[PDB]
């Protein structure tokens, strides 16, 4: 808490007879969902709350603005203060400015409930989520305005140089106020600035200032807002900000999904898994937009870095990162030191509506459906004709770009993401986010000089196909059957420790194969979104429920003939697990059978006593 000193000294300082009070008014708008920690008790469902007003209005506290001003002033001068909460006042350059600044609060009148996000933690050995590692966090929307007033009472001719430079940084759009800045929380922008310098050194202006208690109340502020001059003062010594912004663009060809189970449980559509949407405030009402989260992109890039670098034998994914100095623990921060890269959300450059895709699970024995289960999903549609762009930006700081090894690590990771590995999104086993083209601009070719494609040149044609030998004796006038089960062997070669996705191993292979399919008999792959495709015109549409004659069509994505990846995965999986003599990978182990009994058999009906 405290400890004031009570045996210090007594002094007497004369501070001249000049006094000037400068007012800077305006507003500041949110460009990203912000966060202000107010984690209170008696509510343990969500473990990261936000600060709200007793009538549920988002407020921006005074202490946060004051702390951010102190941090930016200690950034301008390249010397941090070493005060220790006691004794006589500090006489350095930063506190001597902070001793004459007055700010106010804000309310924003929006009063809509905040939105809850979820975060997990992925096991880098099996690829799935870890055990019991799941936590939520409620965030505030985007586009919320706050009024802004700042008074400086000093002895100089207007504001100092440091305050003019810091206000220029805040007008550029680099006012990183609060929150979890590592995942791209509140980044505000100061708009409509106005400034006015009073003169308390004379006698008439001092009396006119004392006559109205300053201009602190609301009527005094509405009277003062008619004597303000537009535009901020120009600084004398513009130093520089220390956060660079570099833009990213990603797009190739495939559908996209980013899971959200609670929205799937509430949504009107009713599908099993849907994508992620976010709201933005339009003054009073909110509007939804589909996006790619910031936590997911941060995790993907962190995993692409952590799987390459050796760190004396044991790779960076097998460490614990608690109290260590690693390469991943320096760029991406730890729980002892803050990070250095701030990611952001990614929007889709259009209004792509989601489609619906159905799937079923085919039994191995008696190949039919599973226990009558159809499961569907609602991804965003992307095709080789409509590539579904993704535009975004992320921030790094100055001393990371000046180094040589950090840019090397980031270039290696982004070159591995650009080539096709590390697919973004959800169900990548059936081709979601399949390929990429990652373009990064705004760093003066410091990182994007390792993301150049290099390839070899063998010119060797794939070795021919062999001629078969298994032949059958087929005659005429003898009608056959279409089923013919295949009796398997009795020994299955199991193993309890599979490889693990922790790194790229030594004697293993990684890459991709390009194929070429050709049909020899008519092919049917249906498009089950609507049933009355071949229905004639000029009649009734359909009643609420009848049993008509269903009529499907062929599968199309953007008026373009395609075959999904699930079909090919299923057929190649069936042949592959028949060859190696594997288990019945999908089966219905329950559901006892039942048979009718015959009347001729009088030996079984001789002991069914009444």
């Amino acid at each position: 808490h405290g400890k004031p000193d009570r045996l210090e000294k007594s002094r007497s300082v004369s501070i001249g007879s000049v006094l000037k009070e400068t007012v800077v008014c305006g507003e500041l708008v949110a460009k990203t969902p912000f966060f202000f920690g107010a984690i209170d008790e008696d509510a343990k469902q969500t473990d990261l709350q936000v600060l709200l007003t007793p009538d549920n209005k988002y407020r921006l506290p005074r202490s946060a603005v004051r702390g951010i001003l102190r941090r930016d002033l200690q950034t301008y001068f390249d010397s941090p203060c070493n005060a220790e909460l006691g004794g006589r006042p500090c006489m350095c350059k930063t506190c001597r400015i902070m001793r004459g600044i007055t700010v106010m609060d804000a309310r924003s009148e929006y009063n809509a409930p905040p939105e809850i996000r979820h975060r997990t933690r992925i096991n880098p050995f099996t690829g799935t989520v870890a055990e019991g590692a799941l936590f939520n966090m409620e965030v505030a929307p985007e586009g919320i305005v706050f009024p802004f007033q700042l008074r400086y009472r000093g002895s100089e001719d207007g504001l100092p140089d440091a305050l003019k430079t810091v206000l220029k940084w805040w007008a550029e759009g680099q006012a990183f106020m609060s929150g979890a800045a590592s995942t791209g929380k509140g980044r505000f922008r100061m708009e409509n600035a106005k400034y006015e310098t009073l003169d308390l050194s004379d006698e008439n202006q001092r009396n006119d200032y004392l006559k109205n208690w300053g201009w602190r109340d609301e009527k005094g502020l509405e009277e003062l807002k008619k004597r303000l001059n537009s535009g901020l003062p120009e600084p004398g010594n513009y130093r520089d900000p220390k956060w660079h912004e570099i833009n990213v663009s990603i797009e190739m060809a495939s559908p996209f999904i980013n899971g959200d189970p609670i929205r799937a449980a509430v949504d009107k559509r009713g599908t099993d898994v849907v994508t992620f949407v976010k709201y933005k405030a339009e003054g009073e009402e909110a509007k939804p937009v589909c996006a790619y989260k910031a936590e997911s992109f941060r995790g993907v890039i962190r995993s692409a870095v952590a799987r390459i670098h050796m760190e004396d034998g044991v790779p960076l994914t097998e460490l614990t990162h608690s109290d260590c100095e690693c390469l991943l623990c320096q760029i991406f921060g730890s729980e002892y030191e803050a990070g250095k890269i701030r990611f952001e959300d990614l929007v889709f450059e259009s209004d792509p509506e989601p489609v619906t895709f159905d799937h079923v699970a085919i039994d191995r024995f008696t190949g039919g459906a599973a226990d009558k289960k159809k499961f569907d999903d609602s991804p965003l549609p992307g095709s080789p004709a409509r590539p579904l762009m993704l535009k975004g930006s992320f921030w790094i700081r100055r001393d990371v770009l000046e180094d040589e090894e950090y840019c090397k690590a980031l270039g290696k990771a982004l070159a591995d993401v650009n080539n096709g590995l590390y697919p973004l999104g959800g169900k990548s086993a059936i081709g979601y986010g399949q390929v990429k083209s990652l373009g990064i601009k705004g760093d003066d070719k410091r990182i994007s000089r390792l993301m150049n494609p290099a390839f070899d040149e063998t010119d060797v044609a794939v070795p021919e196909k062999p001629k078969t030998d298994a032949e059958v004796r087929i005659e005429a006038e003898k009608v056959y059957y279409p089923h013919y089960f295949v009796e398997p062997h009795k020994k299955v070669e199991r193993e309890e420790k599979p490889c693990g996705h922790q790194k790229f191993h030594e004697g293993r292979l990684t890459g991709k194969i390009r194929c070429k399919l050709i049909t020899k008999t008519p092919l049917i792959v249906p498009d089950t979104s609507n049933d009355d495709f071949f229905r004639p015109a000029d009649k009734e549409a359909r009643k609420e429920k009848d049993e008509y004659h269903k009529s499907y069509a062929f599968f199309r994505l953007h008026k373009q003939i395609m075959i999904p990846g699930s079909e090919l995965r299923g057929m190649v999986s069936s042949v592959y697990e028949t060859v190696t003599n594997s288990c019945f990978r999908i089966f219905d182990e329950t559901k006892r059978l039942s048979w009718r009994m015959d009347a001729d058999h009088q030996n079984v009906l001789q002991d069914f006593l009444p």
């Binding site: 298994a470 059958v472 087929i474 003898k478 009608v479 279409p482 013919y484 295949v486």
Partner: protein, 76 residues
């Protein structure tokens, strides 16, 4: 890859012969008529001894899991 299949199963690759017999495609001038039987014999104009004349005959209850494992066996 083939050598690995020689390490587990030594010389009992007799589920690969049937798999190669079931993926066979009619090369040419061969029209193997396949279809499913009818229920009775009085409801198909060909007279092919439907499902109720096979349960007491070739496809008996004891010889049924032998004529359903050989790859191309003639039903009728």
């Amino acid at each position: 890859g083939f050598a690995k299949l020689k390490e587990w199963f030594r010389d009992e690759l007799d589920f690969i012969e049937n798999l190669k017999k079931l993926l066979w495609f009619p090369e040419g001038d061969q029209a193997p008529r396949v279809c499913y039987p009818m229920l009775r014999k009085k409801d198909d104009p060909n007279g092919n001894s439907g499902y109720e004349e096979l349960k007491d005959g070739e496809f008996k209850k004891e010889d049924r899991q032998k004529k359903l494992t050989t790859p191309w066996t003639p039903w009728a």
